[PDB]
Design a protein around this nucleic acid. Structure first.
Ligand code: MG
Lengths: 244, 266, 93, 1083, 183, 154
DNA sequence: CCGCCGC
RNA sequence: GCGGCGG
């Protein structure tokens, strides 16, 4: 982006090819590959699962006494894992950051290359919560990692989700850019022909967002603010922090 | 730009699979509609006051002398409370809003800004990063038509192009005297209907019904001013946009040798 | 990418403008003969099987190459429509 | 090669007859192998008894149905486009009111297709498959109400489609709601009709409900009993005679509407258990004694009131539970249409009872095979269920042979409603693969069935389990019905056992689709094997346990598209089913009984059994598969060999040695190259092309007909009207092209002449090859069905060798799919310390995002097998484990590096250098000897590899191994038309194609926009003009280019012109105008 | 499918072609790998003329027969083709044409085989991976069409996305991977 | 209506919303990268990232709902067991001591110091409205055990 | 959405 | 228009 604004269009094209060339070469000589051992399981996984496991017995003994409602039991257990799983997440990463800075699987993920934190976790840590047919997530988590054999049932259970996702990708894909269609229908006559139109009736782009937690003025996210102001033309002049 | 905006908004639609959203929210938004979970907007701008329980609750915007009664079912979720102010078109219920109502209460400059943002809302939550420019270009066309309440040329039950009226009114007060004000009412037609009833006949002959379109365009000897990609496509002529751009379709190249050579012809 | 496309863009008030000039100019390069150039001396385009790009490979390449320099002029209404093509045939064999 | 398998879960019983679905279904469908004395009770015969006892007085009864002389043989049916059907007739006797006379005789009523030993059919020429079907098994269910969260509604559903859809609902306002076919009426109204009196009714029904105040309400209509039958009739929408015309009521009685499903288990099962108890007859049928008996009605409501009252038994029925889902086996499907034909025939015969002179009418006068034939024929050739047999490779056809579809009749399931059905339901366990479903629209709706999944008496896919008593596991297996499985606490097979005794305290089990940790004392049933959880198709992926279910699918489906390679190699690492697939599929040919071999021809194999019989087994030499793939049987037995019973005599299409093989095992380095394996590209070593590693044979069947025009018969001769002799060489046989000739694009394959001319089957642009077989059907047809007008037909088979090239796409069983980007010279591709170079280089990057470690596993084990020279068999969830692999890899280090020490040399300066970067990487334990180090690095599954281009190592061990990869039915032969100009439609002016000219890609508006946006003015103009409609534009364009000139400027597109006129043709007057509003001329 | 809906809904193009795409690592965003054999047919007319320009053929009809059945045409016909394509470019299209980048222009560099070599960086623009996806290619006939095609339509000129001002020539997985390991 | 929480409950829940906010911003990035990735498109990547993102957004909505209209009751003093009250129950026979604190359904958490039990919880229902000295029972899977409100503490 | 293959 | 596959 910087190169584009700074040195011009085609020159940037040159740099891209440049990066493209080196990136690739260095890529081949770097010697990066995947091996089942490359997906390293954190020693603490056996810990956090045990810690969470016993913790599950407390929740059980607590209901087998009559303290927690049928529902409370459930919600509390999910919470148990929802956190336990996230715990194991940062753990695997902590292990790579401190011990194997140059892990193939890891390096791939960190670098904009490939892999996603959530996936990395399904290999080294463990993919834990997969929901039932309807939507209500399962009570038991998928204790395994892909590194180790994902069990018979854990697999089956996980199946439900993969299928719902496939169905979703279907009817959503075949929509055939339906919107690209209608959009085009109402904007297919809009074009740019002009001389600085004289009418100065402008739109003021808001820099602050109202309520979500309650009434409290916040600074709209960096992203969104950009979206509304980037490449725009100021209606009227504005002295802000010292610049005109 | 028309295209470019339509495109940038369409591609992303492929990944948008109580309150309801996703593509449907995008279709509901581009199409002026009454969403699933409607939220009663406040038509009057004053302060708020409630009346609790009773098989029905009630939110009341009252001030100077009148209060706009809002019936909030015993199963609604209202977040404005007994006490403070509420501008026209402010969410009195929780959830989605209805454009038409919001247009009446607050006004147009609000509908527009509502649509734009409420649209972005979905793409943002879906990772997509598209410039507001585009949602704007579209939305603008959603209100390029207005109704008539005070006539001068044609009768007051018509729905015609907003700008075509800025021409009538401009020359009715400016060039030719007799200030016959052409009072109009901003109209929020849906994206689809904006298209449906798009001024040029050529274009109509394409989607709706080719019979009706030509029928009417026949009677009033219609002159299709060739501007717009669709209509001009049929002509098989160079599109009014791109290189066809009236701005550059006519450009001449000469060499200092032949230029002084035209002076040699003089 | 392209040779000084940056420079080119900076010479026109609008993108599409560039294309038009570029094109029509390529037209004149072949229509009124292929010698209607302005930078044929040392430093004219070229190919690699032999040095024959000196005659007629790609027209546009020339155009742009010629426009990169302050030789040609382009405008909304520079020269009367018909008179242009008449004078050109006369001074170019 | 030694074969070592790591299975530790005692696989108790062998897999069932994989194609049993179809096979047995047809056998029992039409019991034609055994006599009528013990003739069946279902299929054919049942459908017969159904509509046979005819009563119009007339009386025509069924005796015996016999059939069995197949007009012609299989192959003949294929070469002649003939449908392989059996002749079917039956003895029918007509009894007369004149008790003293009767008539027996036989009438042949059409031909019915037969089932092949593989399980496929042969309709019009080609082989087709009748796929299974699923639906709401005609029964009675109770589901919650739509909007009103209040109470639930009752449903009564019985096929066929003619049968009424009944529902039962209770409303606030008042009483019952029983809506049949778009309308509702009082539930009592009918009750009264039948005999249920206010008194008796209320008592037994509301003895616990209080709703009853709903039924006993008639104080006006409830005091007239029969009259209520007439009352109900008035409630029919149509105005009709109130004279007791049971008719529409006769309809929902016993005959048509409800069901004739076998009495006892068909619908009754849904009865007895689910609700109520006993069934009388077949359905709510009893129109006997003036009064009616409906032992079904009150119960349905009798459960409604129980449902809304207490827990008499909690019946909330889960629709998708396979226990209320039946699967339609071929048989039921064919039999179904059969009884429809039976009905259609029974229709005319009754008409022919009043139509003629009494005894003057006999069999013929009552029977016309017209109905039944069109009936059956229509199903096999028109029903949306019978399809082309996907035979890319045996496995493929086999899956397509057993997959279940939801869409079909339309009365079972449609298109726009499926989010619910698409999910893999709880009950799909062992009954439906959760992986076999296809990607894209139509997902989860069409899927192949499980391993041991076998259809029972009436559909409900049953699965096998192992009853366990106390801490003892048994071999006594039971095939449970989806519903029955919920009653028990079943446990997994992974449960450690000491023979028959469990081994752990907290031993996993699943109550009802719910994971629960149970005790050894509560384990009532155990899973047979992990296999049963998936399909055959899936059961073929090595380390499935390490592969994300989403990609596993891609992996299963990809095998279905594997293409037969000349050199077939079984996977260096197998699942354990490869043997079986080739076996129950009928690719290879086995030996029936023990004996010896006689002749081992390359066309036939004759063996002598030790019992006293010598048979000649011909081998389909080189046959054209449905998908155009080679199908040859290559004898693997030598002359005079003592063969064991059930031993491979010859190998099938991809099954070499008797194992299934599709693609080959190649040495592969898993690293990144320049960019040749960028997103999903693959790099291949020219070395592969050299040993014809990846080469498949293909055949294209071009067909030409000698049509009979009223302008003069199109003769087929060597006479080529335009004077060529150089193009008439190959065409030596007067008319036909000679076998063994080389046909290139544009040569004449077959000649023909027609009226004002040369109309000859030519080699369509693309390619041809070598003509290998030819078929001509002249006048005196032996037993072929030549369509009308069709004088004679000519078929020409052409084939060629497919060597792997850059466009081709391969992929492994795990899901890594990709196309060949560059074919590298062995010269400079990744070679190992010892001269051995790799075959293919997979880009690492495609493994993390997608989750399929399974491949990286297979590769490790595959590495051991290379230097250990051995193939392995790793079970689904029970296969090889990470420790055992490292063990075999350790063995492999002594072969790789061991021979290295003796041969005379040590470590390279290169090997040492990569070891430095490896220890600094944390792959090797610092401080150990290079020898020791490399071993530890090899065990990781990574070795050292030198560039090949530079001879310098690739800093960092790289993993390598034998990965089993296949070539897909994707040749680039179907992927590239290059059109400069040619034929245009004569109706619309479009560059359509046909024979010599390719077509032009469409441009659609979706792409025009693309252009518009760019500001691509002329580029767009060009696409709508010079390239499409301006007949003068494209003309000037062509010319100009011929001239090396500058294309002319566009004149008004004919579309503009054509519009002005179309507008002139009517009142409308479209006039084009100038600057100052004045005229302008297009012409 | 009437007549008013005819001029818009679309149709098939002359001078078109389509094939399976394959990654071309060395290739620069500027160019694109196109199969000579395809180019031959694609640029047939343009080739014919150049054939007469060079003694290879006496006339057009001759040049045509010359390509009617003859197997190679070796270096010379090829020398001519490669000469005719000099600075011309072609367009490429991807399966669903979603945004303006759905079609980009590249300079063809003749190559062996069947597949079409595409630049890695543009693989993001056209939703296109190499598991068998196929792209269609077109040719700008007019010197005006050619102009716009290579000026405002070429790949290297459309770096930024019209959607957001963010780049679309972003380095993908492989490149990044390398660049990172080295820094 | 109204949701009641303790000052401790408020802080705990408020912080939870904060943490979930950072998680939502991180799940965002990932999703954005995937959508622009489009290399090995149409796979688990998107559906997974979007699904995870959803589970998050849901916990956020329920957190922002409860926190926007909850009341705070300052009850360190009083006698009867009410919301916020930390009771201690002693099993008669065995003399087993138990520490519990009844709170609104949203504050419940078996992981807290005194086990936070829902107001609308069986055990939570039985305890509300009683004082030091009281004796009561409820149903339990193994049977029914009565406890005596040992003392009521702030 | 675009491309193909066949009654 | 029906069916099958690919992106
Ligand atoms: Mg793809």
């Amino acid at each position: 982006y910087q190169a584009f604004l700074r040195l011009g269009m085609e020159k940037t094209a040159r740099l891209l090819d440049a990066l493209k060339y080196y990136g690739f070469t260095f890529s081949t000589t770097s010697g990066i590959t995947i091996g089942i051992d490359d997906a390293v399981i954190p020693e603490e996984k056996k810990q956090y699962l045990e810690e969470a496991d016993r913790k599950l017995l407390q929740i059980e003994q607590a209901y087998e006494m009559g303290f927690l409602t049928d529902r409370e039991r459930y919600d509390q257990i999910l919470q148990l894992w929802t956190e336990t799983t996230e715990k194991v997440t940062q753990a695997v990463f902590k292990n790579f950051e401190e011990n194997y800075p140059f892990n193939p699987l890891y390096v791939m993920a960190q670098s904009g290359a490939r892999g996603n934190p959530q996936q990395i976790r399904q290999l080294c840590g463990l993919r834990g919560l997969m929901q039932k047919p309807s939507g209500e997530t399962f009570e038991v988590p998928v204790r395994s990692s892909f590194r180790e054999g994902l069990t018979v049932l854990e697999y089956f259970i996980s199946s439900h989700g993969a299928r719902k996702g496939g169905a979703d990708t279907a009817l959503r894909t075949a929509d055939s850019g339906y919107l690209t269609r209608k959009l085009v229908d109402v904007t297919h006559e809009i074009v740019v022909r002009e001389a600085d139109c004289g009418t100065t009736n402008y739109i003021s782009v808001p820099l602050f967002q109202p309520d979500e937690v309650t009434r409290s003025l916040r600074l709209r996210k960096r992203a969104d603010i950009e979206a509304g102001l980037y490449g725009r033309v100021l209606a009227r002049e504005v002295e802000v922090l010292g610049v005109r | 730009v028309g295209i470019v905006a339509a495109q940038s908004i369409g591609e992303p639609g492929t990944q948008l699979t109580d309150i309801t959203q996703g593509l449907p929210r995008v279709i509901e938004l581009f199409e002026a509609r009454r969403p699933k979970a409607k939220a009663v907007i406040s038509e009057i701008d004053g302060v708020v006051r409630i009346e609790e329980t009773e098989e029905k609750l009630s939110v009341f915007v009252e001030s100077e002398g009148f209060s706009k009664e809002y019936k909030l079912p015993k199963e609604a979720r209202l977040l404005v409370k007994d006490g403070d102010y509420v501008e026209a078109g402010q969410p009195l219920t929780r959830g989605a809003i209805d454009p038409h109502q919001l247009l009446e209460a607050k006004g147009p400059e609000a509908v527009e800004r509502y649509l734009v943002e409420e649209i972005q809302k979905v793409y943002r939550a879906q990772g997509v990063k598209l410039h507001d420019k585009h949602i704007e270009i579209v939305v603008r066309q959603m209100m390029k038509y207005v109704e008539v309440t005070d006539p001068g040329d044609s009768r007051l039950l018509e729905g015609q192009v907003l700008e075509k009226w800025d021409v009538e009114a401009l020359n009715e007060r400016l060039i030719a005297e007799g200030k016959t004000p052409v009072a109009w009412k901003p109209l929020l037609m849906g994206v689809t209907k904006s298209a449906l009833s798009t001024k040029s006949w050529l274009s109509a002959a394409s989607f709706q019904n080719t019979t009706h379109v030509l029928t009417e365009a026949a009677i009033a000897g219609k002159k299709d001013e060739l501007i717009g990609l669709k209509e001009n496509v049929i002509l098989g002529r160079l599109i009014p946009a791109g290189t066809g751009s009236d701005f550059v379709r006519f450009t001449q190249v000469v060499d200092q040798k032949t230029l002084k050579a035209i002076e040699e012809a003089r | 990418a392209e040779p000084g496309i940056d420079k080119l863009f900076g010479m026109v008030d609008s993108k599409y403008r560039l294309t038009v000039v570029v094109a029509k100019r390529a037209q004149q390069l072949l229509r009124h003969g292929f010698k209607n150039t302005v930078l044929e001396p040392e430093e004219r385009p070229k190919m690699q099987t032999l040095e024959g790009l000196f005659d007629d490979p790609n027209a546009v390449t020339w155009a742009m190459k010629e426009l990169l320099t302050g030789r040609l002029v382009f405008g909304e209404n520079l020269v009367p429509e018909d008179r242009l093509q008449k004078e050109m045939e006369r001074l170019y064999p | 090669m030694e074969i070592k398998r790591f299975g530790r879960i005692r696989e108790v019983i062998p897999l069932p007859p994989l194609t049993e679905i179809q096979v047995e279904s047809y056998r029992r469908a039409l019991q034609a192998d055994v006599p009528p004395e013990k003739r069946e009770n279902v299929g054919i015969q049942a459908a017969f008894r159904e509509t046979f006892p005819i009563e119009e007085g007339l009386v025509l009864d069924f005796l015996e149905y016999r059939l069995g002389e197949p007009p012609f043989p299989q192959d003949e049916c294929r070469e002649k486009d003939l449908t392989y059907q059996a002749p079917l007739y039956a003895r029918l006797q007509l009894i007369h009111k004149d008790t003293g006379l009767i008539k027996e005789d036989e009438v042949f009523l059409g031909h019915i297709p037969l089932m092949t030993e593989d399980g496929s059919f042969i309709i019009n020429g080609a082989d087709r498959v009748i796929v299974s079907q699923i639906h709401r098994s005609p029964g009675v269910y109770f589901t919650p109400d739509p909007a009103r969260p209040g109470r639930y509604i009752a449903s009564i559903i019985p096929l066929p489609k003619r049968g009424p859809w009944i529902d039962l609902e209770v409303e606030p306002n008042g009483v019952v709601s029983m809506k049949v076919n778009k309308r509702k009426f009082p539930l009592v109204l009918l009750l009264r009709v039948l005999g249920y009196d206010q008194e008796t009714l209320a008592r037994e029904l509301g003895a616990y409900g209080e709703l009853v105040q709903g039924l006993m309400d008639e104080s006006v209509f409830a005091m007239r009993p029969e009259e209520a039958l007439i009352r109900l009739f008035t409630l029919l929408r149509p105005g009709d005679p109130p004279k007791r015309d049971k008719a529409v009521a006769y309809v929902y009685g016993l005959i048509a509407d409800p069901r004739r499903y076998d009495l006892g288990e068909a619908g009754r099962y849904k009865a007895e258990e689910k609700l109520g108890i006993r069934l009388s007859g077949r359905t709510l049928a009893r129109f006997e004694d003036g009064e009616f008996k409906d032992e079904v009605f009150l119960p349905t409501l009798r459960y409604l009131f129980a449902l809304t009252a207490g827990v008499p038994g909690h019946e909330v029925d889960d629709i998708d539970h396979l226990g209320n889902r039946r699967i339609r086996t071929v048989g039921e499907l064919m039999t179904d249409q059969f009884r429809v034909g039976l009905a259609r025939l029974a229709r005319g015969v009754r008409e022919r009872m009043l139509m003629g002179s009494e005894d003057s009418l006999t069999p013929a006068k009552l029977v016309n095979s017209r109905p039944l034939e069109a009936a059956i024929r229509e199903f096999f050739s028109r029903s949306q269920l019978s399809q082309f047999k996907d035979e890319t490779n045996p496995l493929s056809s086999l899956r397509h042979k057993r997959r279940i579809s939801a869409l079909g009749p339309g009365g079972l399931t449609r298109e726009r409603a499926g989010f619910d059905v698409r999910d893999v339901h709880r009950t799909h366990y062992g009954r439906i693969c959760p992986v076999e479903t296809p990607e894209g629209a139509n997902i989860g709706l069409i899927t192949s069935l499980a391993a041991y999944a076998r259809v029972d008496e009436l559909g409900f896919i049953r699965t096998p389990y192992r009853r366990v008593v106390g801490g003892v596991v048994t071999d006594e297996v039971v095939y449970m019905t989806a519903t029955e499985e919920d009653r028990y606490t079943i446990a997994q097979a992974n449960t450690p056992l000491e023979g028959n005794r469990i081994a752990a305290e907290r031993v996993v089990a699943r109550r009802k689709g719910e994971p629960v940790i149970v005790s050894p004392e509560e384990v009532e049933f155990m899973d047979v094997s992990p296999k049963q959880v998936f399909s055959v198709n899936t059961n073929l992926i090595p380390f499935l346990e390490h592969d994300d279910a989403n990609r596993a699918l891609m992996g299963s489906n990809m095998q279905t598209q594997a293409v037969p390679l000349i050199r077939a190699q079984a996977p260096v690492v197998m699942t354990g089913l490869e043997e079986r697939v080739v076996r129950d599929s009928l690719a290879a040919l086995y030996a029936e009984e023990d004996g010896e071999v006689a002749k081992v021809d390359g066309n036939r194999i004759v063996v002598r059994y030790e019992d006293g019989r010598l048979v000649e087994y011909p081998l389909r030499r080189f046959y054209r598969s449905n998908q155009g793939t080679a199908l040859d049987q290559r004898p693997r037995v030598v002359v005079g060999q003592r063969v064991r019973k059930g031993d491979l005599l010859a190998d099938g299409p991809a099954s070499e040695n008797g194992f299934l093989a599709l693609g080959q095992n190649v040495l592969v380095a898993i690293m990144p190259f320049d960019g040749y394996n960028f997103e999903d590209a693959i790099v291949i070593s020219e070395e592969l092309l050299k040993r014809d590693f990846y080469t498949s044979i293909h055949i294209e069947r071009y067909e030409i007909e000698a049509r009979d025009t009223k302008l003069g018969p199109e003769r087929i001769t060597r006479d080529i009207p335009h004077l060529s002799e150089a193009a008439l060489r190959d065409l030596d046989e007067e008319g036909v092209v000679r076998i063994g000739a080389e046909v290139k694009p544009g040569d004449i394959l077959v000649g023909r002449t027609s009226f004002k001319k040369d109309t000859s089957l030519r080699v369509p642009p693309g390619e041809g090859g070598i003509v290998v077989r030819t078929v001509r059907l002249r006048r005196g047809d032996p037993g072929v069905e030549l369509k009308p007008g069709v004088r004679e037909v000519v078929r020409v088979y052409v084939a060629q060798k497919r060597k792997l090239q850059v466009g081709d796409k391969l992929a492994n069983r795990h899901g890594n799919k990709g196309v060949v980007a560059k074919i590298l010279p062995v010269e400079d591709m990744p070679h190992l310390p010892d001269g051995t170079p790799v075959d293919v280089i997979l880009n690492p990057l495609g493994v993390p995002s997608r989750m399929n470690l399974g491949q990286i596993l297979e590769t490790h084990l595959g590495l051991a097998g290379y230097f250990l020279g051995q193939r392995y068999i790793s079970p689904i969830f029970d296969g090889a484990k990470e420790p055992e692999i490292k063990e075999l890899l350790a063995q492999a280090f002594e072969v790789y590096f061991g021979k290295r020490k003796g041969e005379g040399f040590g470590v390279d300066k290169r090997e040492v250098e990569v070891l430095r970067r490896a220890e600094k990487l944390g792959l090797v334990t610092p401080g150990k000897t290079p020898e020791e180090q490399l071993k530890e690095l090899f065990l990781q599954g990574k070795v050292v590899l030198y560039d090949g281009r530079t001879g310098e190592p690739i800093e960092g061990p790289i993993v390598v191994g034998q990965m089993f990869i296949m070539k897909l039915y994707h040749m680039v032969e179907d992927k590239m038309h290059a059109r400069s100009t040619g034929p245009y439609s004569l109706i619309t002016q479009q560059p359509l194609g046909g024979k010599a000219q390719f077509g032009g890609q469409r441009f659609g508006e979706m792409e025009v926009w693309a252009l518009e946006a760019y500001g691509a003015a002329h580029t767009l103009q060009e696409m709508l003009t010079l390239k499409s409609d301006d007949i003068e534009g494209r003309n000037a364009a062509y010319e100009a280019i011929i001239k090396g000139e500058d294309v002319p400027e566009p004149s008004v597109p004919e579309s503009f012109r054509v519009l002005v006129k179309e507008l002139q043709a009517l009142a409308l007057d479209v006039q084009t105008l100038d600057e100052k509003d004045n005229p302008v001329d297009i012409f | 499918q009437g007549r008013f809906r005819q001029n818009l809904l679309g149709k098939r193009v002359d001078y078109s072609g389509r094939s399976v795409i394959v990654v071309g690592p060395q290739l620069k965003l500027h160019q694109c790998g196109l199969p000579k054999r395809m180019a031959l047919e694609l640029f047939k007319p343009f080739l014919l003329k150049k054939m007469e320009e060079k003694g290879i053929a006496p006339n057009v009809k001759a040049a045509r027969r010359m390509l009617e059945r003859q197997r190679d045409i070796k270096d010379e016909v090829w020398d001519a083709l490669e000469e005719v394509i000099h600075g011309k470019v072609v367009l490429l299209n991807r399966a669903p044409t979603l945004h303006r980048l759905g079609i980009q222009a590249f300079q063809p560099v003749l190559v062996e085989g069947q597949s079409i070599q595409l630049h890695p960086l543009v693989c993001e623009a056209f939703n296109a991976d190499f598991d068998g996806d196929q792209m269609a290619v077109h040719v700008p006939l007019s010197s005006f069409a050619q102009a716009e095609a290579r000026i405002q339509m070429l790949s290297a000129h459309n770096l930024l996305s019209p959607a957001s001002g963010e780049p679309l020539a972003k380095p993908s997985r492989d490149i990044i991977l390398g660049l990172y390991y080295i820094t | 209506r109204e949701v009641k929480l303790t000052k401790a409950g408020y802080e705990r829940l408020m912080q939870q919303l904060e943490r979930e906010r950072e998680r939502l911003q991180e799940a965002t990035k990932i999703l954005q990268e995937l959508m622009e990735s489009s290399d090995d498109y149409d796979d688990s990547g998107l559906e997974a990232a979007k699904q995870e993102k959803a589970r998050i957004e849901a916990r956020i909505d329920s957190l922002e709902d409860i926190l926007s209209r909850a009341v705070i009751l300052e009850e360190g003093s009083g006698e009867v067991i009410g919301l916020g009250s930390v009771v201690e129950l002693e099993d008669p026979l065995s003399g087993e001591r138990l520490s519990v604190q009844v709170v609104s359904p949203a504050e419940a958490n078996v992981l807290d110091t005194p086990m936070k039990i829902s107001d609308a919880s069986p055990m939570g229902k039985a305890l509300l409205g009683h004082r030091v000295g009281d004796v009561l029972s409820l149903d339990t899977p193994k049977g029914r055990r009565e406890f005596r409100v040992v003392a009521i503490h702030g």
